[PDB]
DNA sequence: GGAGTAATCCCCTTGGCGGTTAAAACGCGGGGGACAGCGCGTACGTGCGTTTAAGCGGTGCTAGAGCTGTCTACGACCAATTGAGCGGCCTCGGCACCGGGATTCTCCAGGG
DNA sequence: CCCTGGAGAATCCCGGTGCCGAGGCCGCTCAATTGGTCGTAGACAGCTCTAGCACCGCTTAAACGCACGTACGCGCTGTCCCCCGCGTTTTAACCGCCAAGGGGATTACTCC
């Protein structure tokens, strides 16, 4: 991949780096050198691993416009369901038990739908 | 689970010659320089395996490459 | 700071421990344990000036390993010091022979 | 953890106030500075053992001969 | 068919290949040669990450320096390009053993 | 011994070294070692340039033959 | 070195055909190598707390580079 | 009431594939690189008539050299306090190779 | 044949405009101070002395021409070779994707 890394840094020699989960995970040091306008994932149900090093790779990516393309958000385990919002923009408080979890789940799923509705 | 070489390019060996100051070629340019590579590397690894078998111990962090190649006769910087 | 005795600014504590316990001399008797840091400051300053000059040019602001390889091959004192070293992440000195050339 | 970088930028401010450099140059600085330290320590080790006088002149001779 | 004199288009090849930080060695099989060398006698290396780049660049330094010395010995003779005898001259005088 | 006699090389060494430090002197030793080392380097260069001439298809070495002999021997 | 010493060197001298060339060349680096070695000796003997060159302080003169 | 058995976390490998580009090679044209024998002469070849120096050996101590009393001149412990830059973050200036625009690099078949 | 009208190609002056980027800034914390203790490297006075340098006095060892004289240095000249030019194609490493057991650690449960 270095043979096409010479005239590669700045210009639209690639209009988009189609960088799968392959190069993000193992080269977070190398992927900290050039600007990236967009940020997406595909079917983020399997990326529920918040403590994965890909999270460290993509967290420092100071991107002006993130995005997420999840095939199907789950129906239980509120943590992985809010993980989509957390990947989209880490601006919400870490605590999520105030919405539901300990204090009858019809209101819980209704609140889940409500907090999802704008996003 | 082992892999082996196939011939070391017409093109990339040609660029090796290009940065070596070569424009045309003879019949003795591609293959033999890789033979010198193999001989020098086999000598340096012969010394290394002698070192690591006389005392029967492993190696240490990436600082070995600069010291071993300096004794060999061509070392490197960069980090 | 613990290094401003003679215009130096590199850390002294761990350096004091290492130079005092250098395991090469029995005792540095009056005595320049800070002279290693002195030459260290000297090399740091020369690298600062050279890297600033190199980065500021080429219509850029960063040091590509090409520029540092060129700087390393440029100096003569460094060549006399250890002339059997090479710089990575770059290329060899460009060359073409007039006999090679048509 | 410990960084010579702050002192290096202090010296830069002594030389140039608003210049930016690269991290690879910093790593090469680390490598070459430390190997200079190792060589200068190695050179001036047993000079005090050349004759029965075992300082500053050891490292002075080291820098005199390596340069 | 704009076919010009070889050597001058080879000169533009030299100019392109001797300008930037381009990795002229299309050489992951160089890495496989290094792997065959390393696992030829021992195993369980457990080395660093970017050490392959450093060892390969040392390989480049050795081989390319051999290339320039060979070309100097070649223009020393009446043959401009790389010859095996010039490489023997460049390596034997270095103290190959 | 000294194919170039001891007195010529001694005169040359003293003349060359008089400029470094005043009143420089040598003991009974350090008289014939310098010429021996110089001739050892010369013989090594001779072997290298002879190999180069063997390649060069001419027994006659030249300026460039000795240049290649000296340059590629290590320095 | 004079004409007869170079003459014997050329007698060894690859069937003597290399005489004139070595006559012209081998004297160029003689003084250079001599100056280099005597400068190294002076630097080695600089730290000897003595007043004259002694073999005691020149044992490890080229320990750095062999 | 801390450890013995053993149920738990778990993550990391032993290994085999998607996706993948470079890695080495073909491949045709030719023309510059491949390597040398001769021309002849210049490029060395050489061995005995003709001398300064080199490596010395005949006194007397003769610039640096190793030399033993008894020390002058200093460089490294611990114990309560404290400041340098580090423990962690990412701020505002200035980035970073092919495009707007194309004259360069290189050869060739007619003007001439 | 020279000289050239015309043909081929290809990346240098400054950005893409959103982020790389280096070590200032929050102050605290861990080996530096100074409170006393402590005996070791460096060395001043000390005495002729190692082998032979100032004379004299050297014997030939390299060091110097001559009288020709007798072959090879570099390119003409020769085939010859010959392998890139750069497009095109097929061997060819790295990094996620999979679903499991080992097993070090670690405590649920317990027990003598
Ligand atoms: F992108 Be998928 F198939 F949810």
Quote the tokens at residue D14.
């002594």
For D66, nearest residue in chain G (alpha carbons): G64
CATH topology of domain B1-79: Histone, subunit A (1.10.20)
Nearest to D4 by CA among A52, C47, A3, B41: C47
Alpha carbons A78 and A102: distance in angstroms, whole number: 12
CB-CB neighbours of C48 under 10 Å? 22
Experiment type: cryo-EM
Quote the tokens at residue C55.
């980065």
What 3-state class would DSSP assign to B62? coil
Domains defined along chain E, listed by start: 1-96 (1.10.20.10)
Alpha carbons B38 and F51: distance in angstroms, whole number: 23
Alpha carbons F75 and F44: distance in angstroms, whole number: 13
Quote the tokens at residue F24.
């420089």
D1-67 to CATH, choices 3.40.50.300, 1.10.3720.10, 1.10.20.10, 3.40.630.30: 1.10.20.10
Contact of chains D and B by CB distance (3 or more pairs under 8 angstroms): yes
Alpha carbons A68 and A84: distance in angstroms, whole number: 7
Alpha carbons D4 and C49: distance in angstroms, whole number: 16
- Cβ of D7 within 8 Å of Cβ of C3? The answer is yes
Per DSSP, the residues of chain E read -----TTTHHHHHHHHHTSSS------HHHHHHHHHHHTTT-------STHHHHHHHHHHHHHHHHHHHHHHHHHHTT--S--HHHHHHHHHTT---
What class is the G1-66 domain? mainly alpha
Cβ-based contacts of G30 with chain F (< 8 Å)? 38, 42
A40 lines ligand 1 (CB under 6 A): no
A42 lines ligand 1 (CB under 6 A): yes
Asked if F68 and E73 touch (Cβ cutoff 8 Å), the reply is yes
Q: Which nucleotides of strand H are protein-proximal, with an atom < 7 A from a CB? A: 15-16, 18-19, 21-27, 29-36, 43-46, 53-56, 63-66, 74-77, 83-88, 90-91, 93-99, 105-108
Give C87's strand partners: B77
Domains defined along chain C, listed by start: 1-85 (1.10.20.10)
Contacts made by residues G30-39, CB under 8 angstroms, sequence distance 24+: G30/F38, G30/F42, G30/G1, G31/F12, G31/F16, G33/F38, G33/F41, G34/F12, G34/F13, G34/F16, G34/F34, G34/F38, G35/F16, G37/F34, G37/F37, G37/F38, G38/F13, G38/F16, G38/F17, G38/F20, G38/F34, G39/F20
Per DSSP, the residues of F16-75 read HHTTTSTT----SSSSSHHHHHHHHHHHHHHHHHHHHHHHTT-S---HHHHHHHHHTTT-
- Cβ of G48 within 8 Å of Cβ of D50? The answer is yes
Alpha carbons C1 and C35: distance in angstroms, whole number: 17
- Cβ of B77 within 8 Å of Cβ of C100? The answer is no
Q: Which nucleotides of strand I are protein-proximal, with an atom < 7 A from a CB? A: 7-12, 14-24, 31-32, 41-43, 50-52, 62-64, 72-75, 81-88, 91-98
Q: Name, in order, each residue with C-beta under 8 angstroms of F15's C-beta and a sequence gap of 6 or more.
A: none
Q: Provide the chain E residues 19-38 that lie in CB contact (below 8 A) with chain B.
A: 24-27, 29-30, 32-38
Q: What is the resolution of this structure in A?
A: 4.4
Asked if E25 and E55 touch (Cβ cutoff 8 Å), the reply is no
- Cβ of G60 within 8 Å of Cβ of D46? The answer is yes
Please measure the distance between the N-terminal and C-terminal CA atoms of chain A and give it in whole angstroms: 37
Alpha carbons C97 and B18: distance in angstroms, whole number: 11
The Å distance, Cα A47 to ligand 1 centre, comes to: 12
> Of the residues A42, A44, A70, which should be mutated to test ligand 1's pocket, given the most ligand atoms within 8 Å of the CB?
A42
Quote the tokens at residue B52.
């690591």
Going from the C-alpha of F32 to that of each of E11, E43, F10, F28, G38, the distances in angstroms are 53, 53, 8, 10, 13
Alpha carbons B19 and E17: distance in angstroms, whole number: 7
Question: Could you tell me the sign of the dihedral formed by the alpha carbons of C35, C39, C44, C45, in that order?
Answer: positive
Give B77's strand partners: C87
Nearest to A21 by CA among A62, A68, A54: A54
Alpha carbons F73 and G13: distance in angstroms, whole number: 19
**Atom 4 of ligand 1, residue of closest alpha carbon:** A71
Alpha carbons C69 and B78: distance in angstroms, whole number: 9
Asked if B65 and E54 touch (Cβ cutoff 8 Å), the reply is yes
How many Å separate Cα A57 from the centre of its chain? 11
Alpha carbons A55 and A68: distance in angstroms, whole number: 14
Alpha carbons B29 and B35: distance in angstroms, whole number: 11
Quote the tokens at residue C79.
């060549």
Alpha carbons A89 and A66: distance in angstroms, whole number: 7
Asked if C79 and E2 touch (Cβ cutoff 8 Å), the reply is no
Domain ranges of chain D: 1-67
Alpha carbons B79 and D31: distance in angstroms, whole number: 6
């Amino acid at each position: 991949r270095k043979e096409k890394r010479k005239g590669w840094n700045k210009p639209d020699a690639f209009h988009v780096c189609i960088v799968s989960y392959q190069l993000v995970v193992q080269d977070q040091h190398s992927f900290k050198r050039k600007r990236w306008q967009y940020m997406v994932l595909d079917e983020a149900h399997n990326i529920k691993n918040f403590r994965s090093t890909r999270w460290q790779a993509l967290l420092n990516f100071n991107t002006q416009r993130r995005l997420l393309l999840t095939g199907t958000p789950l129906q239980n385990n509120l943590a992985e369901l809010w993980s989509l919002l957390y990947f989209l923009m880490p601006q919400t408080v870490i605590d999520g038990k105030k919405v539901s979890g300990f204090a009858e789940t019809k209101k819980t799923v209704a609140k889940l739908h409500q907090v999802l509705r704008p996003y | 689970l082992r892999d082996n070489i196939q011939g070391i390019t017409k093109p990339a060996i040609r660029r090796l010659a290009r940065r070596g100051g070569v424009k045309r070629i003879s019949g003795l340019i591609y293959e033999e320089v890789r033979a010198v590579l193999k001989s020098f590397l086999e000598s340096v690894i012969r010394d290394s395996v002698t070192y690591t078998e006389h005392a029967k111990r492993k190696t240490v962090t990436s600082l070995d490459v600069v010291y071993a190649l300096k004794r060999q006769g061509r070392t490197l910087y960069g980090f | 700071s613990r290094s401003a005795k003679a215009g130096l600014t590199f850390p002294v504590g761990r350096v004091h421990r290492l130079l005092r316990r250098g395991n090469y001399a029995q005792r540095i008797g009056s005595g320049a344990p800070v002279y290693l840091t002195a030459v260290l400051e000297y090399l740091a300053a020369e690298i600062l000036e050279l890297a600033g000059n190199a980065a500021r040019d080429n219509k850029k602001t960063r040091i590509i390993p090409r520029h540092l390889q060129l700087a390393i091959r440029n100096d003569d004192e460094l060549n006399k010091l250890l002339g059997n070293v090479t710089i990575a992440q770059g290329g060899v000195l460009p060359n073409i022979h007039q006999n090679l050339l048509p | 953890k410990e960084t010579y970088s702050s002192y290096i930028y202090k010296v830069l401010k002594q030389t140039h106030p608003d210049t930016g450099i690269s991290q690879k140059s910093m790593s090469i600085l680390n490598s070459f500075v430390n190997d200079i330290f190792e060589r200068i320590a190695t050179e001036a080790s047993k000079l005090a053992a050349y004759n029965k006088k075992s300082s500053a002149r050891e490292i002075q001779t080291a820098v005199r001969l390596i340069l | 068919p704009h076919r010009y004199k070889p050597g001058t288009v080879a000169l533009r090849e030299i100019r392109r290949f001797q300008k930037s930080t381009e990795l002229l060695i299309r050489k992951l099989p160089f890495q496989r040669l290094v792997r065959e060398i390393a696992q030829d006698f021992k195993t369980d290396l457990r080395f660093q990450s970017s050490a392959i780049g450093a060892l390969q660049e040392s390989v480049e330094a050795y081989l390319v320096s051999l290339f320039e010395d060979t070309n100097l010995a070649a223009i020393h003779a009446k043959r401009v390009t790389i010859q095996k005898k010039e490489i023997k001259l460049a390596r034997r005088l270095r103290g190959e053993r």
